[PDB]
Design a protein around this nucleic acid. Sequence first.
RNA 1: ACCGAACCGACUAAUGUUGAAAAAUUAGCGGAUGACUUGUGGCUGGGGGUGAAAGGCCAAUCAAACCGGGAGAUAGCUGGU
RNA 2: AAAGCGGGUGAAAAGCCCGCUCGCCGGAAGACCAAGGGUUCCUGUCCAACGUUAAUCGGGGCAGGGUGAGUCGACCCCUAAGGCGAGGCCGAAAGGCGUAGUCGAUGGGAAACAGGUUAAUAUUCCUGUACUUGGUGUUACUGCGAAGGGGGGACGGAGAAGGCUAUGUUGGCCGGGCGACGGUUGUCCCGGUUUAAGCGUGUAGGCUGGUUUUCCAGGCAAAUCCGGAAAAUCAAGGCUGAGGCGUGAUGACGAGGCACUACGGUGCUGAAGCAACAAAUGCCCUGCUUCCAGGAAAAGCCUCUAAGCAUCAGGUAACAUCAAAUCGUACCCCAAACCGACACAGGUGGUCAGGUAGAGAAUACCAAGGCGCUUGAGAGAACUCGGGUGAAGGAACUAGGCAAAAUGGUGCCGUAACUUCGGGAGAAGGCACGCUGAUAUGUAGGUGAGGUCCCUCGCGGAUGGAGCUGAAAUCAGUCGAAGAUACCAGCUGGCUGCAACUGUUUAUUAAAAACACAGCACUGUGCAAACACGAAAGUGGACGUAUACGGUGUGACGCCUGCCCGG
Lengths: 93, 46, 271
Amino acid sequence: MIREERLLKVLRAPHVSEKASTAMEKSNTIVLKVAKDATKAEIKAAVQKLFEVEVEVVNTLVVKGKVKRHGQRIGRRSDWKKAYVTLKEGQNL
Amino acid sequence: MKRTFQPSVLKRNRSHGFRARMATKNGRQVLARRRAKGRARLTVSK
Amino acid sequence: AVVKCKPTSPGRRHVVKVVNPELHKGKPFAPLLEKNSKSGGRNNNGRITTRHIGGGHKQAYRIVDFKRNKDGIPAVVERLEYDPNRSANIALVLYKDGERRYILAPKGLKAGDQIQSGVDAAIKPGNTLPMRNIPVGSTVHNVEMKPGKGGQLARSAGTYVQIVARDGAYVTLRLRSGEMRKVEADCRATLGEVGNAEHMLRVLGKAGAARWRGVRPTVRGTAMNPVDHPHGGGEGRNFGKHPVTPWGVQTKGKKTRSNKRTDKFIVRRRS
RNA sequence: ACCGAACCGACUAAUGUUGAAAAAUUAGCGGAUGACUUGUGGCUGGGGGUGAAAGGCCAAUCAAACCGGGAGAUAGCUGGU
RNA sequence: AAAGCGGGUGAAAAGCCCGCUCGCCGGAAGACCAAGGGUUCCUGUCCAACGUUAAUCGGGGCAGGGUGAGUCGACCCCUAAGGCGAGGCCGAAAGGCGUAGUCGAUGGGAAACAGGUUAAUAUUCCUGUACUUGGUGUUACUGCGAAGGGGGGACGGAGAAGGCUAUGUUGGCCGGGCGACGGUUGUCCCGGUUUAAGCGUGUAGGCUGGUUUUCCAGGCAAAUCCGGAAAAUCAAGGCUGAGGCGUGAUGACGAGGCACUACGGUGCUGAAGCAACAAAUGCCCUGCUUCCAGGAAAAGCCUCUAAGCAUCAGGUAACAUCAAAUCGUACCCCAAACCGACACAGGUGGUCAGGUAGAGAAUACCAAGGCGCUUGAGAGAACUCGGGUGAAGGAACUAGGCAAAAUGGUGCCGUAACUUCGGGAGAAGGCACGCUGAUAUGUAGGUGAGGUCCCUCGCGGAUGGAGCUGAAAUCAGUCGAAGAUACCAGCUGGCUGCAACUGUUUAUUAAAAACACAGCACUGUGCAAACACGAAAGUGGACGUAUACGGUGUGACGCCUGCCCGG
Ligand SMILES: [Mg+2]
Ligand SMILES: [Mg+2]
Ligand SMILES: [Mg+2]
Ligand SMILES: [Mg+2]
Ligand SMILES: [Mg+2]
Ligand SMILES: [Mg+2]
Ligand SMILES: [Mg+2]
Ligand SMILES: [Mg+2]
Ligand SMILES: [Mg+2]
Ligand SMILES: [Mg+2]
Ligand SMILES: [Mg+2]
Ligand SMILES: [Mg+2]
Ligand SMILES: [Mg+2]
Ligand SMILES: [Mg+2]
Ligand SMILES: [Mg+2]
Ligand SMILES: [Mg+2]
Ligand SMILES: [Mg+2]
Ligand SMILES: [Mg+2]
Ligand SMILES: [Mg+2]
Ligand SMILES: [Mg+2]
Ligand SMILES: [Mg+2]
Ligand SMILES: [Mg+2]
Ligand SMILES: [Mg+2]
Ligand SMILES: [Mg+2]
Ligand SMILES: [Mg+2]
Ligand SMILES: [Mg+2]
Ligand SMILES: [Mg+2]
Ligand SMILES: [Mg+2]
Ligand SMILES: [Mg+2]
Ligand SMILES: [Mg+2]
Ligand SMILES: [Mg+2]
Ligand SMILES: [Mg+2]
Ligand SMILES: [Mg+2]
Ligand SMILES: [Mg+2]
Ligand SMILES: [Mg+2]
Ligand SMILES: [Mg+2]
Ligand SMILES: [Mg+2]
Ligand SMILES: [Mg+2]
Ligand SMILES: [Mg+2]
Ligand SMILES: [Mg+2]
Ligand SMILES: [Mg+2]
Ligand SMILES: [Mg+2]
Ligand SMILES: [Mg+2]
Ligand SMILES: [Mg+2]
Ligand SMILES: [Mg+2]
Ligand SMILES: [Mg+2]
Ligand SMILES: [Mg+2]
Ligand SMILES: [Mg+2]
Ligand SMILES: [Mg+2]
Ligand SMILES: [Mg+2]
Ligand SMILES: [Mg+2]
Ligand SMILES: [Mg+2]
Ligand SMILES: [Mg+2]
Ligand SMILES: [Mg+2]
Ligand SMILES: [Mg+2]
Ligand SMILES: [Mg+2]
Ligand SMILES: [Mg+2]
């Protein structure tokens, strides 16, 4: 059992993009920015219990940071995880 | 021409890495010298 | 047999090889094989301690029974095999109770023979007896130094040790160096000369053959520099020195044995 | 073993020499189943290693590496004051 | 390696975009990775700086997007070289070695393919069809169990041939065309003719005799397993195995045709989808033959029992359900992104391997695909660089034929001194070579359908030659100055020094006559070996034992190696 503490901590944000919108309108997939130490089972349980939908599978990938320059001072935008959550044809968030 | 630096991360880390520095007794002295100087990066790992 | 190669190439012109048709051609005995890695003459400090060793063919070690301890059980010599770790050939021998062993092959032993070890064994080649039981004047090999230790003398191809006397608890052996040594009468010894005498008639024919056996080239001190060898230096070919080893000890005639522990056992030096 | 590409090397000539290159290009040249060549990894440490031996090679440095230290060595020598 | 022009954008175009030509690479200058790098990938916008010029462009600035895995790789199990190393042995201290262990791939270990899609990912997403391992729960039978025993995993070099496939060529079929300039309804021209893993069958080939009893000093104890011994009985039994065939597939894909377009590309439909021949360096093949230089380890896997449990657990077989987490996945990768300070004529491991000519992965021209090398325009002096040709002479040049020129291929004829009988030798030297026809409407050879016959019956054997492919030769004729027409591709001979030879060497002025060498001799060494590394313990020598090992000198082979012990 995964605690509600853990679920409410692991789901971070929705993701908006052309590819995310295409995934939503084509394969019934939502794209979520997720905290890095969350696993596939944790993301599946969190979505399934907080959005009140049902999940087929979940796919994760870690998005790497970006090296940026702010007034000739080098900096590094941080990593995060992205989750493509597939729903079972009848949920339609 | 083949130059003297043919890089490899594995050999780099086994030679100059933090665990090799802590493994040899004088490597810990090297880390003491670099910490006392105040280096941003102690070993080649970062 | 000693067969000369035809000179169809400069390397093969001088080659003399020893071909033995009685040897096994298949794979050796997997229970008795072992690995050994080559060292290159380097000890645990990593330094070259013995020069001119390195490379060659990969080899596997054969566990050879030098003790010959399974006494009282007759054994059938099955086949002769090539051992790459020594000059002599080995023999895979099947004991009467179902266990197989490797032994040195004595001269005249062939496939399907009878051998036997122990104090009651007969006097014929291949049979192992203590030298208190072995008659004097008879040639043995695989001779022990200490009771139960294992064979250490007359183990290369074609060699043998002649028992010349027996005085109480010690027997005197004439060794292939020409040396008379007293050894305990309880020590074991296998009758007959070691086989593969024709091994001494081989000619390698080429540096490639030496490198296959695993010996690196030897550089003369008189060709080295003065910093490298005590012989090195000179404009042109100059020697002017007494011949020494690379570490400075004279190498033509200077005796190096110093063992007061076994001076008591040595009767006569090799002269 | 022989002829000859890959691959390994480096015999001759010209160019280049503040170069395209802190050792190459072009045209020819030698080995090319062997004492061959190569990828990944390991080992040998400085009066030491390794050396089919040239005092060769050990990170563009080798009749004794590089780095810090004794150290502001010493300089009956040169320059400057 | 090379550019020209037309249009577009823009303040401005040799360089950016689009088009038509022209040229270069094409065993790479094409496509995919490992190593290494780190956002260089894609889109929008900008031209200060960077780009050896300009810039509307960029691998530059800024902002936004982008990397989707039970099956690929890591992680993980297992070991090599080697590392560390509880106790331990040793050492002024620090520390050196090392047993049990535990790490360490470059190696061994389970499983996914085809099509489609995005501006940027795909064996990861979608469609279709599969496969693997482990946990739980029912059903049926049942002796299960290891840190231990056995088997297996499990292994070299070279060579030769058979069977195949990838692949290519031609024919057939399907769709299209009737040609800017003579001819082109024909033996004419262009294009397409693709389809996987998995599942079923088990063929060419390879290996081995099976099966049942009884007994045993062996496998650290036990064993029904391995080994050994003695009987009986049968002769085909087992294991391995490319390819083919069927299915997967009434599916997908498909030249084209039809319609929009923000002219970049989308949406719809879709015929034929076979045969013969040639053929790998790939597969059978971790094979077979042979040679000496005698060719990893451990786990996964199969199997036997001990202690133990003993109608329990546990095991095998079926079905159902669940789970397979975590990390990499963009992009470059013979390079403008890695190593070279540079957008540097250098270096960098593996995988794929089309056509014609060719022995060929050489070379010439091409295909798929990619480029024209980030300064141009003129002019046509000396001189320098890279080339081409050259009257007469032909080394007269020079230190020296340095350089250049020349020889150059296949088949046959022929070939000396000397020799270690192998060589020298491709000695030297010479002749033929294109194209068309005939022998022969395409021959010898290769492959081999239909039909027929037989059977221990199918992926079977005999006959039989359709069809396809195809040298080499002889004869005749003919063209040119010349038929190996280009590219590619030995100069030859004679006397001689040295070193026998193949090799190695001064990375970066010395490749040699030096070094090495096989062979020879002397000498040390009896094993706790001499000797070497080490204050020592240890280790190499060597798991070797005087036919072995170390040191020293000479250097194949032939004939030899003389006198001196005063230093
Ligand atoms: Mg999925
Ligand atoms: Mg992932
Ligand atoms: Mg030696
Ligand atoms: Mg020698
Ligand atoms: Mg010298
Ligand atoms: Mg000296
Ligand atoms: Mg002289
Ligand atoms: Mg003199
Ligand atoms: Mg050769
Ligand atoms: Mg070299
Ligand atoms: Mg040179
Ligand atoms: Mg060249
Ligand atoms: Mg040659
Ligand atoms: Mg050659
Ligand atoms: Mg010198
Ligand atoms: Mg250097
Ligand atoms: Mg000094
Ligand atoms: Mg002082
Ligand atoms: Mg000073
Ligand atoms: Mg224009
Ligand atoms: Mg241009
Ligand atoms: Mg263009
Ligand atoms: Mg071309
Ligand atoms: Mg950037
Ligand atoms: Mg771009
Ligand atoms: Mg401007
Ligand atoms: Mg500019
Ligand atoms: Mg950019
Ligand atoms: Mg170990
Ligand atoms: Mg300890
Ligand atoms: Mg240790
Ligand atoms: Mg391990
Ligand atoms: Mg690996
Ligand atoms: Mg891409
Ligand atoms: Mg085919
Ligand atoms: Mg080959
Ligand atoms: Mg990619
Ligand atoms: Mg450039
Ligand atoms: Mg470059
Ligand atoms: Mg290469
Ligand atoms: Mg080519
Ligand atoms: Mg001119
Ligand atoms: Mg000129
Ligand atoms: Mg010319
Ligand atoms: Mg002339
Ligand atoms: Mg003339
Ligand atoms: Mg003339
Ligand atoms: Mg003159
Ligand atoms: Mg002259
Ligand atoms: Mg010349
Ligand atoms: Mg020429
Ligand atoms: Mg003809
Ligand atoms: Mg002379
Ligand atoms: Mg020579
Ligand atoms: Mg040089
Ligand atoms: Mg000499
Ligand atoms: Mg003399």
